[PDB]
Design an enzyme around this catalytic site. Structure first.
Site, PDB file in Angstrom:
ATOM      1  N   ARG B  10       2.916   9.445  -9.006  1.00 10.33           N
ATOM      2  CA  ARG B  10       2.455  10.885  -8.254  1.00 10.33           C
ATOM      3  C   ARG B  10       3.672  11.191  -7.459  1.00 10.33           C
ATOM      4  O   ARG B  10       4.220  12.146  -7.416  1.00 10.33           O
ATOM      5  CB  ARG B  10       1.108  10.799  -7.443  1.00 10.33           C
ATOM      6  CG  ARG B  10      -0.186  10.317  -8.138  1.00 10.33           C
ATOM      7  CD  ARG B  10      -0.194  11.175  -9.322  1.00 10.33           C
ATOM      8  NE  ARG B  10      -0.517  12.800  -8.923  1.00 10.33           N
ATOM      9  CZ  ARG B  10      -0.445  13.985  -9.406  1.00 10.33           C
ATOM     10  NH1 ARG B  10      -0.176  13.884 -10.787  1.00 10.33           N
ATOM     11  NH2 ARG B  10      -0.649  15.071  -9.079  1.00 10.33           N
ATOM     12  N   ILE B  11       4.259  10.121  -6.683  1.00 11.19           N
ATOM     13  CA  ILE B  11       5.394  10.490  -5.587  1.00 11.19           C
ATOM     14  C   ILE B  11       6.701  10.790  -6.458  1.00 11.19           C
ATOM     15  O   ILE B  11       7.120  11.653  -6.334  1.00 11.19           O
ATOM     16  CB  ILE B  11       5.307   9.433  -4.539  1.00 11.19           C
ATOM     17  CG1 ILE B  11       4.196   9.354  -3.590  1.00 11.19           C
ATOM     18  CG2 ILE B  11       6.793   9.675  -3.881  1.00 11.19           C
ATOM     19  CD1 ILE B  11       3.872  10.972  -3.193  1.00 11.19           C
ATOM     20  N   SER B 148       5.017   8.418   5.883  1.00 14.45           N
ATOM     21  CA  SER B 148       3.630   8.518   4.898  1.00 14.45           C
ATOM     22  C   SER B 148       3.325  10.268   5.078  1.00 14.45           C
ATOM     23  O   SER B 148       4.116  10.982   5.848  1.00 14.45           O
ATOM     24  CB  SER B 148       2.592   7.973   5.199  1.00 14.45           C
ATOM     25  OG  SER B 148       2.023   8.255   6.600  1.00 14.45           O
ATOM     26  N   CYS B 149       2.566  10.698   3.980  1.00 17.20           N
ATOM     27  CA  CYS B 149       2.305  12.125   3.948  1.00 17.20           C
ATOM     28  C   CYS B 149       1.493  12.309   5.458  1.00 17.20           C
ATOM     29  O   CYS B 149       1.822  13.605   5.961  1.00 17.20           O
ATOM     30  CB  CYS B 149       1.429  12.382   2.808  1.00 17.20           C
ATOM     31  SG  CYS B 149       0.102  11.039   2.540  1.00 17.20           S
ATOM     32  N   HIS B 176      -9.088  12.370   3.948  1.00 11.05           N
ATOM     33  CA  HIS B 176      -7.975  12.437   3.000  1.00 11.05           C
ATOM     34  C   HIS B 176      -8.563  12.788   1.475  1.00 11.05           C
ATOM     35  O   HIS B 176      -9.795  12.109   1.133  1.00 11.05           O
ATOM     36  CB  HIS B 176      -7.203  11.245   2.913  1.00 11.05           C
ATOM     37  CG  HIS B 176      -5.828  11.285   2.561  1.00 11.05           C
ATOM     38  ND1 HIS B 176      -5.532  11.219   1.088  1.00 11.05           N
ATOM     39  CD2 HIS B 176      -4.665  11.355   3.085  1.00 11.05           C
ATOM     40  CE1 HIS B 176      -4.458  11.267   0.806  1.00 11.05           C
ATOM     41  NE2 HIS B 176      -3.601  11.232   2.152  1.00 11.05           N
ATOM     42  N   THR B 179      -6.721   9.513  -4.000  1.00 13.25           N
ATOM     43  CA  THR B 179      -5.144   8.853  -4.336  1.00 13.25           C
ATOM     44  C   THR B 179      -5.414   7.930  -5.412  1.00 13.25           C
ATOM     45  O   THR B 179      -6.647   7.548  -5.681  1.00 13.25           O
ATOM     46  CB  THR B 179      -4.542   8.504  -3.246  1.00 13.25           C
ATOM     47  OG1 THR B 179      -5.103   7.282  -2.816  1.00 13.25           O
ATOM     48  CG2 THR B 179      -4.423   9.405  -2.040  1.00 13.25           C
ATOM     49  N   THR B 208      -5.420   3.369   8.531  1.00 17.88           N
ATOM     50  CA  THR B 208      -4.284   4.230   8.362  1.00 17.88           C
ATOM     51  C   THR B 208      -3.284   3.761   9.567  1.00 17.88           C
ATOM     52  O   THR B 208      -3.791   4.072  10.563  1.00 17.88           O
ATOM     53  CB  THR B 208      -4.161   5.437   7.815  1.00 17.88           C
ATOM     54  OG1 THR B 208      -2.894   5.913   7.871  1.00 17.88           O
ATOM     55  CG2 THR B 208      -5.146   6.302   8.827  1.00 17.88           C
ATOM     56  N   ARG B 231     -11.602   8.727   3.388  1.00 22.25           N
ATOM     57  CA  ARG B 231     -11.110   9.343   1.857  1.00 22.25           C
ATOM     58  C   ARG B 231     -12.502  10.056   1.313  1.00 22.25           C
ATOM     59  O   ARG B 231     -13.576   9.571   1.621  1.00 22.25           O
ATOM     60  CB  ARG B 231     -10.838   8.435   1.115  1.00 22.25           C
ATOM     61  CG  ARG B 231      -9.682   7.263   1.419  1.00 22.25           C
ATOM     62  CD  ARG B 231      -8.924   6.369   0.726  1.00 22.25           C
ATOM     63  NE  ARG B 231      -7.986   5.238   1.414  1.00 22.25           N
ATOM     64  CZ  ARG B 231      -7.091   5.329   1.537  1.00 22.25           C
ATOM     65  NH1 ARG B 231      -6.368   6.193   1.064  1.00 22.25           N
ATOM     66  NH2 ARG B 231      -6.423   4.269   2.195  1.00 22.25           N
TER      67      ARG B 231
END
Ligand SMILES: NC(=O)c1ccc[n+]([C@@H]2O[C@H](COP(=O)([O-])OP(=O)(O)OC[C@H]3O[C@@H](n4cnc5c(N)ncnc54)[C@H](O)[C@@H]3O)[C@@H](O)[C@H]2O)c1
Ligand SMILES: NC(=O)c1ccc[n+]([C@@H]2O[C@H](COP(=O)([O-])OP(=O)(O)OC[C@H]3O[C@@H](n4cnc5c(N)ncnc54)[C@H](O)[C@@H]3O)[C@@H](O)[C@H]2O)c1
Ligand SMILES: NC(=O)c1ccc[n+]([C@@H]2O[C@H](COP(=O)([O-])OP(=O)(O)OC[C@H]3O[C@@H](n4cnc5c(N)ncnc54)[C@H](O)[C@@H]3O)[C@@H](O)[C@H]2O)c1
Ligand SMILES: NC(=O)c1ccc[n+]([C@@H]2O[C@H](COP(=O)([O-])OP(=O)(O)OC[C@H]3O[C@@H](n4cnc5c(N)ncnc54)[C@H](O)[C@@H]3O)[C@@H](O)[C@H]2O)c1
Lengths: 332, 332, 332, 332
Positions: B10-11, B148-149, B176, B179, B208, B231
């Site tokens: 993804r990144i 991080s995002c 969030h 992912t 986190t 999440r």
């Protein structure tokens, strides 16, 4: 005590199921003008969230028969026209969501109901959460409110934390599952435009008065709590996140110990406690008002902590409505 | 500047797309041992979340050709074996997630890379968020981290709020999106058991370090911020909820005005501002690190406020990686 | 041609967006009594499924201004009261879903509309699918129907297959995304009880007349096609599965070749073709009525084949409504 | 009979739960090298899909204790190294999915297992579906296969339909819930690229050999059945759609009557029947292999019908594995 139920939606049907599952109260009458008897059989029998109804349900002679108990069915749009007295319903669960005031809920009193329990937050009816202020009820209150699912989650934990440490101020966010008021796709909603956006697609922010309503049932916390909600694409289970400044210093272990002692004591069955790696589905069909998640929460220091509490916003609230009716019948 | 990309997840893929969409950097090499060239064509071309790639992508002569620009493809499991220098990649985006230390990221330096940019939080590499501390970078830092995002969402808003009012202490919860690390159904996960539960089914709580990592890029906030994550079953967009005690009194309108002025000024394109009834899908493919949601947030008093910020955890973070590389190339 | 739009739901708004995106027709009037002008601005601007609207939209002087073009807004519950003629709307897109008959759609003709295009299947209005029977339209038909999204998917593929091989008989199942008619949680629905069950939670079976409606637009296939639908928890994209007995023998490669030739020829832009490993999100915002999925389908023998076709049931159908209006204006 | 279980995934854990729920077989050993004893306690106890495990589960003296019955735990990557004989496991449920051949499954026979039951389709092991061909088993077959969940859904219905009417040819599409092999977001998959796309986001097409595998257990149907699958964003329940040409004419009422008689007779508990407005959640934790949905299906004529059958692909298949083991132990 014999109970009538106005409205056969999520709250009404699940209150009926809780009544039959626990046997604590007897449902004798149901009013819903938009759901016929056979449709009521179908909707009660099959539940996507909580599974099929254990026990039997069928239509007989114009009546809904759950576990062999015939229930009178009314199809009335105006509560005053309902013959609660003829069916013998002493208490009425006002669960439609559109009769949440004393004057609107008293229409049931006109129809022969002795007392009315509003299953939504009320602007003027006295509000009770089991385990928090329910002992403040007395047999002179004809119309009462059971608050909201979110309030029934926050208030017991807030009561424990305030009693032992003192809540100077707290802010709440609840990550809340999808409810009946949302839309499958982007659609019109009266004034809450965000609630009109597709529920499965979005994280949706919402205003909720539950944290401020905790101040009603815990007067010492009045004006010290507020918060908001993010609706998310999940069917049933919701979680409360309380971030609070503590008057007295509290290590996270001390908070855990106090909450566990409360869950094992006077708040047993109301406030839950767990230290497992729980997720939301682990509380589906759970009957607690609030299960403290010890591992999920975090502390910044001894006076600033973030506390996490799970709650099945459907099952737990319905069981609390049943328990409130049981307590009121005990105080007759 | 010519950029190599280690990892095509993804990144990595979205960093490549951001490079081509904005034209700010030139991707010349990609390393991924588990994704062949034609599979790379497929995965780059079709995206469930962000749509099909505008422009062209095909395989030619063992190379990935995006918008007519041939990209050298490597299939190496060890970063030191990658011939970054032969392809001409001056910078490398370490996006695999398993080389997030200075010594592990220097294997790319061995392969001819001049500098390495880790697209994950790092234990020891210097960490930069665009608009917060990126001017603290200098051309003597070979290996850097883009955080991080979530950190790139929190840090700009926290910087504005601390600069104007002063953050005595803050607690963060991010709602969030799902992912790649999660599971479709309940399955094994090494030590984070909750992340093993089905992602579509659950609200899942997670630890986190992003809020504490904000203390790295804003040293005055060190030890004053921490938080957790839930999440939820959404594909892309995430939201930050910051609950903070303000050193100076701040009406919510003052915070709104200050944040809007910051979004229109030095933090333009990094910190967003909106007063619309936005939901999560309204920020899909948005390139901001953090869009302040004025209406979603709430205040209890003049010193205790809850602030809401949206962030596309995929697109915004990739664009910030690109912008960090552009700034580093400018400081050469 | 100048177009009025009755109803501002998914179909109405996306027909408006298709009109502005392609510039093929000019929207001049919109009627929706439940959505005010500013709410119309919000709902048009932000779309969860298709993203934010490229271009501008704002309210000016009681009018909706999309890309600088002022649109007259009406708030009428009865179509006859709408002043289509004063606004200059020659054509009207009846998109509410509750005026799908000739007599009900002629109320728009009373209001000054020259012609009415029903964006739903009609019981008695002549029905047209672009690329299938639209040339059978003539300027003497005041009221027409564009059929359904599912019909616009099935009919072109069925036309190609019948023309080249002959469909002795076919059965259709469409796996259809969630639509506005469903419920987020289990709730009341008039007679279709399954559609009342929670849309995000369930695979839901549904009756659809689209396959039989293909017999209207392809008379030789009348009585040879029918099918059903399973609603599933996806926001936008749907897929058609056609299982048919072929009159003439057809290897799967021959069917692929014929369908690809049709997609590149007279049905270009209507019938799509792909051999990629496509999933549903790969056709979000796609404007085709039907994209043949070569790899997804399977054959049992030379006379019994299962054919797969994707379709964005929102975007493609709206673009087909626009194209039908363009063709009708050309035949004026 | 005493049963060992190789693999503690969805199939292994749910086979264990079915063993304890029905008490038909005794689980004595479990092998999984990637899940430790305490993680096994957690994963067995909490299930997102099927709820918490009724009964108790804890770790004692290196053993998993379910309902007071100690289970030996092995952590072996090679089946031959497992000491099934020492634990007393006569039968072994090969549920990892990577030992689905006779030679690979015989490694368990080396470890002291008397017989091996593969809980996946096998290339060469004899395949049995309960109620279809299980009486063709004999005590000389050491290694058998229980086929797939989809095969166990299709084969009983296909057997009934072929026995009474004769299936000239049939095509199958199963709308299948998400499984462990999919990805939460778009990610790499070896050769099945579509299965790499995000499961919650997409309708995903898939190749399945279940319909052709029905020809193995019903030899007269060999070569007359095939089909495909569309994976969809649902956690558990799947549905089979069989479109078939009938040798003998059959009104839909005749098919309904025959299937209901079969569900009430020799196939009771295997083939279900319902005429209710069922959705997918109505069969969660259902133990049937296949529940005929009378109202969902449709007929075109007397020889071409589309038949619908629901199946909990997790619970039903596990109960069928248990029932196959019970039958094999009876034939000892
Ligand atoms: N589900 C939750 O999470 C939850 C928890 C606590 C409180 N509440 C609140 O309780 C209220 C009930 O909501 P629900 O969750 O039961 O969902 P719901 O919308 O399914 O229930 C509404 C039902 O009431 C019936 N009804 C409508 N108007 C009526 C009238 N005039 N007279 C009689 N019956 C009528 C309708 O048939 C409908 O089925 C809502 O206001 C909700 O906010 C919900
Ligand atoms: N997606 C987000 O929201 C987000 C935002 C910011 C940061 N991050 C972090 O960035 C990291 C990358 O995650 P992603 O989101 O790109 O998802 P992802 O898991 O799709 O990407 C991983 C890719 O790396 C490749 N890879 C694995 N091992 C490798 C190796 N040894 N050498 C080279 N290539 C290898 C694999 O092919 C895989 O496709 C994660 O640690 C994530 O935490 C994620
Ligand atoms: N979305 C699809 O997949 C799709 C595709 C093709 C056809 N259709 C059909 O088209 C019709 C429209 O559905 P949608 O998909 O637009 O969803 P939708 O329900 O959002 O649209 C309905 C809109 O019409 C408005 N409206 C209601 N009554 C009205 C009246 N009396 N006068 C004027 N306006 C009124 C409401 O404000 C609402 O916003 C439905 O019947 C649907 O079956 C849908
Ligand atoms: N869930 C269904 O719908 C369903 C139904 C019928 C059949 N099946 C098939 O059964 C097989 C099992 O799948 P699941 O559904 O149980 O999901 P799953 O992936 O959760 O189970 C796999 C488990 O096996 C363990 N394992 C992996 N390698 C091993 C090894 N070498 N030795 C021992 N244990 C090992 C892992 O710990 C993992 O937890 C798959 O092939 C699936 O196709 C699935």
């Amino acid at each position: 005590v014999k109970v009538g139920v106005n409205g056969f939606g999520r709250i009404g049907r699940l209150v009926t199921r809780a009544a039959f599952n626990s046997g604590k109260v007897d449902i004798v009458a149901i009013n819903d003008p938009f759901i016929d008897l056979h449709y009521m059989v179908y909707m009660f029998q099959y539940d996507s969230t909580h599974g099929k109804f254990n026990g039997t349900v069928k239509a007989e002679n114009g009546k809904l028969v759950i576990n062999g108990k015939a229930i009178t069915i009314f199809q009335e749009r105006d509560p005053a026209n309902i013959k609660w007295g003829d069916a013998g319903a002493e208490y009425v669960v006002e669960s439609t969501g559109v009769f949440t005031t004393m004057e609107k809920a008293g229409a049931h009193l006109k129809g022969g109901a002795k007392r009315v329990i509003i299953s939504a937050p009320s602007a003027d009816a006295p509000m009770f959460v089991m385990g928090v202020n329910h002992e403040k009820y007395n047999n002179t209150l004809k119309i009462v409110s059971n608050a909201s699912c979110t309030t029934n989650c926050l208030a017991p934990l807030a009561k424990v934390i305030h009693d032992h440490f003192g809540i100077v101020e707290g802010l709440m966010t609840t990550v809340h599952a999808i409810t009946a008021t949302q839309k499958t796709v982007d659609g019109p909603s009266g004034k809450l435009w965000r609630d009109g956006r597709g529920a499965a697609q979005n994280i949706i922010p919402a205003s909720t008065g539950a944290a401020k309503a905790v101040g009603k049932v815990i007067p010492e916390l009045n004006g010290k709590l507020t918060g908001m909600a993010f609706r998310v694409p999940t069917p049933n289970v919701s979680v409360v996140d309380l971030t609070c400044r503590l008057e007295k210093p509290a290590k996270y272990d001390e908070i855990k110990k106090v909450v566990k002692q409360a869950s094992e004591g006077p708040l047993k069955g109301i406030l839950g406690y767990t230290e497992d790696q729980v997720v939301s589905c682990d509380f589906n069909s759970d009957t607690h008002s609030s299960t403290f998640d010890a591992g999920a929460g975090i502390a910044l220091n001894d006076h600033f902590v973030k506390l996490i509490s799970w709650y099945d916003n459907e099952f737990g609230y319905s069981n609390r409505v049943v328990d409130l009716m049981v307590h009121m019948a005990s105080k007759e």
